[PDB]
Amino acid sequence: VRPIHPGEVIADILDDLDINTANFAEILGVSNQTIQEVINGQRSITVDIAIRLGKALGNGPRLWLNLQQKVDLWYALQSHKEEYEQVMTLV
Numbered sequence: 001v002r003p004i005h006p007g008e009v010i011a012d013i014l015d016d017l018d019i020n021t022a023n024f025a026e027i028l029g030v031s032n033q034t035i036q037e038v039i040n041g042q043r044s045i046t047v048d049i050a051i052r053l054g055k056a057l058g059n060g061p062r063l064w065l066n067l068q069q070k071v072d073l074w075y076a077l078q079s080h081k082e083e084y085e086q087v088m089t090l091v
Contacts, residue, residue: 003074006067007039013057028052044068 014024021039025032029052037043045053045068050061 003070004067005041005071006045006064007041009067010035010053011039024056027056044072 010024014020021035022032025035028035028049030049034043034049038045038049045064047061047065050064050068053059053064054061
């Protein structure tokens with residue numbers, strides 16, 4: 001059970017709305033690239049992006065920041081787990 005990336009939620013919204021990333025980027029006032037990077041999980045939601053999402057969709061920024069924080073923590077914990085398993089592993 002990996003966390004749901006904000007980008008995955010966005011992609012699903014755009015799919016339901018039958019609009020593309022460029023159309024949505026235009027609405028938000030950011031570049032297509034920036035939206036596509038979020039969708040592809042290459043770029044994190046910033047406060048600025050959360051605010052724009054919140055206004056455009058009418059669901060507020062916190063939903064989006066919460067999504068991103070959960071992702072951030074999951075990757076931090078994964079990383080920590082790997083790091084320590086490695087330290088603890090004998091060759």
